[PDB]
Amino acid sequence: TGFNLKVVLVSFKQCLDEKEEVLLDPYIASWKGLVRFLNSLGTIFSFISKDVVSKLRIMERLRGGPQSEHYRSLQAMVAHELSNRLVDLERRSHHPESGCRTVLRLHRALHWLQLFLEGLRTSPEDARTSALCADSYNASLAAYHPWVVRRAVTVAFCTLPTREVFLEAMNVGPPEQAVQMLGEALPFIQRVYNVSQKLYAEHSLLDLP
């Protein structure tokens, strides 16, 4: 029953080393956990997250390929792809699937997840899970999606259960306990997101095609 979300959220701890580099292996591992979380929410969430599975595979290929060492961290990846002109900076052509542009999309998606869970964490007892999901989507990831894609994604929101059931489905006790867990574990995702955001901002990569 439900999903062991705490393990996945806490795994984001492993994504940052002492130098605050975002390590790609744990990043991919944590994201695979998030995909299993999404799968547990139902077929529509599996459907809309196919994009994320595809991008994780792209990153696994790069990390297993000849230049694997250069994808050890997002920092190493950026240095390697920029200096070797392996990133399409203006229009997608010769490197439509660079690690840089690919991780960018994973990162934007991560923001939705963290905003959704944080809204959930602080929600009143009467809040609807569907509204928390839509609101966090439209605040965040929707900005990068064409209106028609937003409509397709939105189909998913009404399939979510009540707040109580959704919280209990995290397998850590009643809603107030699940709330405690999110308070503990969310900071791990937020730190990874912030470090990643600043890295991309620093190199003017936030709008890669």
Mark the binding-site residues for an N-acylsphingoid base 1-phosphate, compressed into ranges. Answer: 51, 55, 101, 105, 145
CA distance 85 to 101: 13
Residues 89-108 that bind ligand 1PW (CB under 6 A): 105, 108
Of the residues 23, 87, 109, 208, which one makes contact with ligand 1PW according to CB under 6 A: 109
**Mask: binding to ligand 1PW, 142-161, rule CB under 6 A, as x and -?**
--x----x---x--------
Task: Quickly count: other Cβ atoms within 10 Å of residue 88's Cβ.
Answer: 17
In a 10 Å sphere around its CB, with 0-12 CB exposed, 13-18 middle and 19+ buried, how is residue 117 labelled? buried
CA-atom Rg of the chain in angstroms = 17
Binding residue positions: 51, 55, 101, 105, 145
Q: Which long-range contacts (CB under 8 A, 24 or more apart) does 61-69 make?
A: 62/99, 63/24, 63/25, 63/28
Residue 170's SS3 state is: coil
Q: How far is the CB of 85 from ligand 1PW (least distance, A)?
A: 20
Residues 30-69 that bind ligand 1PW (CB under 6 A): 41, 48-49, 51-52
Of the residues 141, 170, 181, 182, which one makes contact with ligand 1PW according to CB under 6 A: 141
* Residues binding ligand 1PW (CB under 6 A): 41, 48-49, 51-52, 105, 108-109, 112-113, 116, 133, 141, 144, 149, 153
